[model samples]
Target chain A: ARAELARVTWPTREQVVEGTQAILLFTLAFMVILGLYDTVFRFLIG
Target chain B: MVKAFWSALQIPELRQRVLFTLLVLAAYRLGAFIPTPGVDLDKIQEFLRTAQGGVFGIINLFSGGNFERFSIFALGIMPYITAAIIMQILVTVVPALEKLSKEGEEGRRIINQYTRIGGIALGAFQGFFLATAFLGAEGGRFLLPGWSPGPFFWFVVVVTQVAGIALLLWMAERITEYGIGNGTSLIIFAGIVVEWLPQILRTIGLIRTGEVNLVAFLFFLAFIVLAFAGMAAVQQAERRIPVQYARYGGQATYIPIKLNAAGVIPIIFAAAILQIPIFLAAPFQDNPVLQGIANFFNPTRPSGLFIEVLLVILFTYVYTAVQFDPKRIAESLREYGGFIPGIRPGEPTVKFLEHIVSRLTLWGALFLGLVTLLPQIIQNLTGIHSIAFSGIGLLIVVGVALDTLRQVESQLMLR
Candidate 1:
């Protein structure tokens, strides 16, 4: 078990940074699009 | 194809891992069939069928119809997945967890341990609620064939359900260790695929009966095929950024950035968030205030069309942020003698990568939004409910399959 655990390659700091940033940016973009869709739909339906 | 299969089998470790994954998956399936102790299966199924296709239906889909059966695996691995997501989000907000997350391998192990504990906690919570709901409802019984228990029935039910969930978590972990792909994901994938098969068959049956009509069915089939192709393309599509390996002979490389890095996680997050209100207002579904909220979020409602689109978009972005870390990536590249061509290492490189990712994320977010809304639009136009399957189900099925294939292929390559 210990040996198997040792074999795992943890992501480096740079990888983490890139990954996290990608997540944040994608999240923000998705939110914006949805927010706009919500507004437009409300206008149309309401 | 035969040669490729032979080559895969020639690798001992790869062969073992593949076999292990299959065996564990089979075990999970078998366990799912074993009925939970206290619930009346007939009543549960009747209730599920009557319940409008909403969050519960979606959850049932992932549970491989076990939720409808109220089987041992009815709770599924969702509790575990939910726990992990919650812990990850908390890590950012909670100082102790954040520090622990940064503590290298030891930290991760600790966090994983905590995640397991959290999973059990969630499992128990859900289990209790399930038991309580069962008992409160008419025709709910502890066992079949004149079997009954006194006060201990509830305790037994709770313990058994919780144990079932823990076992699922263990099984998934085992698969990850000795099998292919993300273990939990594969379980969910299998469930969704199995559920989809019957529906697909039913649609074909409808066509044969002339209920669907040839032209409409043809259009539906064509749309499904096109949607599948589009989803595959989206999954593989990426934004490539040029990088230079300064330490390794100054070689140039392309860093392929996935368009939807978070896959269907954002949708899941959004669904979970929305379901909170629905679950809270369960008793008040008849009340005007709760009914209004329910109607707005109900997938069958027209208003729900916009809400689903917005939630999908919102969750996509939120989950993406949760999963990506550009600063860490930049630092790693600097340490490893890699850099975006012409971009300085360290902070400058981090900033550059972040800038590129931000732009790419916008495209990804838009892509997800379109994907989420496209199915609903098609359903509205075609008047075919089966077309709705192309959204989350299609995305998750493709994503999980691709991920599993990648894991298997990598293992083979390693061997």
Candidate 2:
């Protein structure tokens, strides 16, 4: 089990960098979409 | 389907992981059926029925109906999740925690230990309140008929509920170690899926009854497929920014930007924040003014729709900022001999990335809010309670399924 776990190839620094960047971009996009939805819905409700 | 199933099972590690996950999920479901002492089952069910679209409704979704039954796992893994989030926020604000976080694996282990302690503390606090609510004159209908609350009752409630939560946390950690995906999330996923099953059955039932046309059913199925495809696209979608990596033979690489970074965390945060006022006023439900105030924030009420939408949007931005640190990213890249094309290594890169992230976050937040509110809109328009189970529930189900599958794929690739 230990050997098997050790065999798992960890992500490289470049991969982490790319992955983190992607995640950040996605987070930002989703936040913007949600914000607009909230504003529009609130306005309509009011 | 057969080919896919055969391939999945043929992969030894994947099969073991899948089986382990299933077993843990089954155990969790079994635990949810075990009731705590001194609670009235009937009253709990009654409360939960009215709690649909309320804060507890969300809790029920994560508890696999345990909250409604007031079972041993009624508290569920919520306390642990809350504790983990609290620790995460603290690591950002507190110098000591920040230092600890930088300590690498050892530091993370210590932090997790602290989270467990915090989880216990939170469980105790929530258990006390839950006991009070359950033992109260009006709320005690779930208590054994003619049962009386006393000092012993308090002790029983507190001890049992807190113990239940601790056990759940333990189970989640074990699942994380031996099973697949994030253990806490899998638990919640299992619960949400179970809650959704009834709605799926009802949809099929509607078809059988000829109440819904086949075309409409097909359209719904297509919509579900499209929604899943959209989720996958969002999950895998990224903006590729070209970068020069001088360390690796000066090769060109691209930093990919994801379409949604914060995942479902923002939604969870927004949901919790929205529930705070409702939870605070729950004890005063008998008071007309307090009840009215609570109702306004209750998702079942018209007023709550706006609040939910607003919070989902706000938290999306807040959580995205919390999770993604452009400064750190830029610093890391500078250390690793990477630079964005046409940009300086450090400060300029940070600024450029931050600007792009802010713009992207706006769109991401809006998407999350719209997806979240979609079910409520459907329910209102169709007068179908099933919409609730179909929309948000489906998103969570699909999201978690995709996440778990990704983990399995990574494990498989390891071999």
Candidate 3:
């Protein structure tokens, strides 16, 4: 496993930070999208 | 990684999967707003205005705030979640269930059927409790006005909630089949984020009103980034165990054990269990015993954080044990003609593997416990409310995010 660990092509630090940011950004995008959809639903009731 | 994501989107099939998942989630969000017919909307709203963070809030959290709105999906996926939890517990304790789960694919299919039944039963019970609570009188206040409390209300709420959960089960199953990742877990992640995102936005909105402290918010912004970085690092950390493949090759390879193999199950269970006092207090109201229990376990207080963290640690160990069965792994290794480099093939390997697993779990459990208390430390020092930033939400958010991304990555790789 240790050899494989070394063998594995691990992502770099920059990739990780940017990856985390990307994931967060996607979450934010979904949240905003859902929030908008929810408001429409709320408006439907109104 | 961003390039990988772009590449993932570029794949036509993968793009379809991603779009399907998004649509499924949108459908879920839409369902959360549609009201159960004949429900007294105003009264439900009134109850929700005060009931956001008690037992109702926790339930509402599981339901993605649907419970607050008396929406059709108000029961959310928790009926299934709780049922799955219960079934897993049964498999651990009941000899028959244990044997059944060991029966392989067919066994799992049966077990899933039982889970569906259990979900319906639980959905009914929760709906009943919610109905009675709604119809319940408190200091001359009833949750619903102009409606008499009776078996009819019970029938209505139970039927509606249970039906909604059944539909949810269908939708989630489809999402898993047609979309990406574990549909149930994604829904749960959505539950946390959908509810969480609004509070964050609301906080932003409140920045102009002087009601919320900008410093505290800004501080948490950095804290959240750090937390995500640390969590992603630890979430991916694994312990490697060397295995010599005797049949396939003379060469030795190793298997990696995840630092936290139990994943976010423990956190969700801990949150559910910790809400007991709040759940009890919600129904009984001003009762001395209930209020005392609630106050003592209040998440804002240090003692509450201590107990929750302690419980999360304990639950992590228990769940890890449930997930990590070394005997079976040892048997599989033996069958495959594989042996640990340092240990003998059967009992010794199991023992050695078990030892490694336990020690590793201890680290994982402690890390989880400590991370949960991060919000506690900040809240105490800064005198800011931090209930939403606790272990359960953060872990699920990050865990689910990475899981989905990996799913995408894997699909992209397959191409």
Candidate 4:
């Protein structure tokens, strides 16, 4: 079991950093968009 | 990321699809803001303020905070997800469903058809339950001051909720058919992340109020970054089992089994299941027996944490089992004249694959359970429960964002 576990290839530091950047950017973009949607809709309707 | 987005928009088809998805999501948020006709938004919002940490918070999380004010889309997409889960399990247990599941595309379509119908039915049931709970609890405290709870009021609320779920389901279906990533997941992703600014503001409030120590807050921030990097690495990790093609002796390939092949589904399923006790015990507050059960499963409790972790591990295995069919994979390998380098082609290969997957699942499940509980553990130890940060939400947001970005990148590459 340990042998097989050792065989697993994890992402490199570069890939991990890149992935984290992409995720943060994508989530931030949507947060702004949806946050605006919430604000406007709440103002106009609620 | 900016370069990738610029290039993505240059591709006409991909750009159109992305635009379509954004539009659909905007419409969904609009539905979330429109209050259910009979519900008093002020009263519901007031009730939600004090009830933010427990199961109610989870409900709000699922519904994208639409449930907090009893919006038209108060039920969110959970009923559909629960229905999908039910259908998946049934396909394993029921003989007829098992046959249908094995029949490939057409059969799967038939089952999906049933899942959608089941979603609507479950949505109706949930709507009625919510309406009843509101009416019964504290003599309709959630209603407007002058408004009386009546059959017509129940009718309006329940029908609006059901219609909301149906419309959301249809829109999600459209998104999946035409848009980039999985629609249901993206919708859930949207729901979880919509409250991000508010959550962060609240965390800042904690720091300002001296409720949370500055050093501890900085450490927590570092912890979140480290966790993100770790999970990203784990998601990309794979065990590649070498395969050789008999026809082309020079050719080599391998089946890449991901470390966390089950992905976010296990966490999603676990949360859905754990919410059951809270929902069931919620309306029966006067009854000691129901209230006792609910208290036991209150996620802040030790036993509840144990159950949550246990469920995460259990669903990890369940999702992996349903996902990877070693026998079928082995059969296809044989058909294509490919065999694992060391393992024999038929039953031996299946057994080998299963053994590897089982071990992988064990590690994967443990990792998932730990990640899922980490936020709660931090809260318990640090006594900073006001942050409203959840490992589940972070995981889903990260996972889905990664998935959607990958899809768009691949499309750009294809063009």
Candidate 5:
């Protein structure tokens, strides 16, 4: 596995940054939506 | 990559699976908010704040902040994970079980059914204990206190939670089959992701108010980015062993052995077990003895961190060993009429593979321990324990994302 580390081509910095942005934006949007639902659940069920 | 992802979504099967997975995850997150009746909302809130350390910390992390609130999915998929691992270990050690493990598909289905049943029992047991632990907080106010202990309340709470776990299990199974990734892991991954947002927002708020130092926040951001980078390295890392087929007239292929064969699984297992003391001692949190136990088991604590590091190291080795059976690999290699360079076709090859694996495991465990410990230190020092430490949670998040991305990429590449 140690020998294979270099063989596994890593993501370039551009891809990393791009992926990071997508994930953050997706997570934020999902969180807001889910958090809204959570509040409603908390209200009705709490 | 984004365009590829879009194209993959344009593909019907991929789109269906991706949406189906998101739907299942949304259902899971929703379930985590539905309260188990008869639990005090006020007290659990206070308890959650005060109880952020120790087992609560671990449970809160795993449960996606649901356990603290007495949600129906309060137990999350943890009991199922725990029971499944127990069954895995049993099959390895017990002669009768070892025989079962050797049996065909029927045997596995039977084992799976047994593990699910075990999960229900485990879920019920922990749910009962968890509800009972919310006893007499802040001068004898309780869900059903000492003088008025309601068996009916306990029964309802426990039964509801057990049922909840079963429901989540089914949803996760569906996701695994019809959806893209492993449902159980993806569910936990969703929990961690959902749980993390508020913490991030809260930190941002503090920074805006000038309560948290800008320098400190900058350092934290750098820390998490570095963690993400390191995780990507490990996740993609693998060792490819050359294999040649005599039957195919000298056709050669390579089998890639993953660097983290266990991936975040060992860390997950270690973290899960490490939280048990907190679960057991949670009700007695005020007692000095109980407090000592919680503190000792807490990964953030110095003493607790030592135990946590040890568990990760040990579990990494065990999980890796279980995942890669050199004997089986050697047998398959022999059956295929292939041999490695400078090694015999059978036992020597097995030994060679084992030697390489051990070397890998050492470095693997070392990196895992170091990374896992980093989160404990960060979370402890910050006193922020809503979800998980960035060190581990983002580790899982990035890993899952990358994996799903790869699968999608492969599907798109299919002519």
Candidate 6:
């Protein structure tokens, strides 16, 4: 299994760097939208 | 990436789908806040504050913080998920279900119908038990003090939560059909992100209050970054198995098997499954042995943590097996006159693929187990409980987000 792990093709640093930014952007965008909705609902209902 | 997203929105169909998904999520969060009528949410909130550090914390996290407020959607989509899990495993054990599962689209639709009914039944039972438990809790006043108490209140709570589950399931199907991403995952994703953002703010608040030191907080932040980066790399990692076809000038191709074929699902299943025993033993709290068992099930304990990591490893293998059937793949490839390089096209190829998958899953499962277990160990050592950043939850968020973004990109390119 350790040898298998060695044979596996891992993502390059460039792919990780580019992909991580998009992933983070989505995460942060979600946080912002959800934050706004939560505050709006909290005000409206709570 | 931003340019791609903007261009994606320019496509009318894709735009509609994106808006529909966002609307469903907005509705979901709205329901998460709307308390089930006749129940005093203030009392539920008070109880949850004390109980949150224990098993209820896991419940609340999965329910997307709905459990804390005792919302109409308090049960969240977990009942549906649990039902789906049971039905999935049953397809392997039950001969009838196995036949139905193998029967193609219509047959699977039949099974999906059954899963829906199972979800409703499970929701009713879960909702009833949770209501009774809250109403019976010591010093708890779940029902309004001024309201007249009756069996009808319990009925209403159960009905409302069951309806919430049904509605959520419907919305999920809608998202999967007409919107971007898998609806159920996106719903869970939305719920987790809603709960998670507040925790991030609260963590920063704790640092401001000097409850958690800035140095420890900084380390936690770094750990979060490293975890995300590692997960992305693993998700991208694959093994390309070479194949040659008998036609088209004997062209050769390769099948890329992902390192983490199971994705974030095994962690989700592991955490959700472990909660069942604790919930079952809740009503037996007065019994010393049952209490001991329930305490042992608490993930904070070393024994419980061991079991959770084990479950992660086990489910990783089980889910991968369920997803990628080497026999079916081998048969399909042979049907197409294709064979893996250096391997015979029949049983030998099946054995070879199975051997590789099991070996690959070993690494994948161990990584999942380690990531899922690490934050707890860190929290124990640092004594920093305010962060509430669950490693499992983070993995699910990142994994589902990446998958959804890929779908969006593909949809844009099709335009």
What's the TM-score of every candidate structure?
Answer: 0.75, 0.80, 0.85, 0.89, 0.84, 0.89
Alpha-carbon RMSD to native, per candidate: 12.4, 11.4, 3.9, 3.1, 3.9, 3.0
lDDT of 6 by residue, B232-321 (tens): 777778876556666424334567778776576777777768878877875554678766777676665566667877888888877787
A best-first ranking of the candidates according to their DockQ comes to: 4, 6, 3, 5, 2, 1
Model 1: CAPRI class? incorrect
Model 5 Cα shift for residue B179 (angstroms): 4.3
The CAPRI quality class of candidate 3 comes to acceptable
Per-residue lDDT for A6 in model 6?
Answer: 50
lDDT of 5 by residue, B328-381 (tens): 666666655777666675467656766776767788788877866766567665
Clashing pairs in 4: none
Q: What's candidate 2's DockQ score? A: 0.02
Tens-digit lDDT track of model 4 for B106-205: 7777788888888888998987786676554466677765566767777877788778888878878888887755678888778877754575666677
lDDT (10s digit) by residue, model 2, range B1-415: 1234346678777677766755655566667776767776665665656742244565666676777777778877888666656666677678677566665767777788878888888888877786675445454455765556656666777777677888788787887787755777666656665665545557667768865656755655565565555555566555555466652344345556665664677777676677567766765646777677666776644457667777878787777776436656655675557665688754675576567657666766677667666555555544245324535556665566555445555666776
Question: Candidate 1's residue-wise lDDT over B1-415, tens digit each?
Answer: 1234446568786667766765666667666665656555554564554443243555566676677677677777777766656766777778786566666757777788878888888888876665554444333343454434434666766776677788788888777665654677667766665665555567677777765667766775566555444554455556555556542344345566565665656766665665556555543434577756655665544566567667777677666665437656655666567656566655785565555546655666666667667666666656366422636555565555444433455666663
lDDT-better candidate, 4 vs 6: 4
The candidate that achieves the highest lDDT relative to the unseen native structure: 4
RMSD of 3: 3.9
Q: Give DockQ per model, in order.
A: 0.02, 0.02, 0.29, 0.56, 0.26, 0.53
Model 4 ranges off by over 4 Å: A1-3, A10-13, A42-46, B1-6, B48-54, B95-106, B209-214, B247-251, B345-347, B382-388, B412-415
Considering chain A alone, what is the TM-score of candidate 1?
0.58
Give each model's whole-structure lDDT.
0.59, 0.61, 0.67, 0.71, 0.66, 0.70
In model 3 chain B, the worst 10-residue window by lDDT is: B135-144
Q: Provide the fnat value for model 4, as a fraction from 0 to 1.
A: 0.57
Candidate 6 local lDDT, residue A30: 77
Model 4's CAPRI class? medium
Q: lDDT for model 5, please.
A: 0.66
Model 1, position B65: C-alpha lDDT score: 69
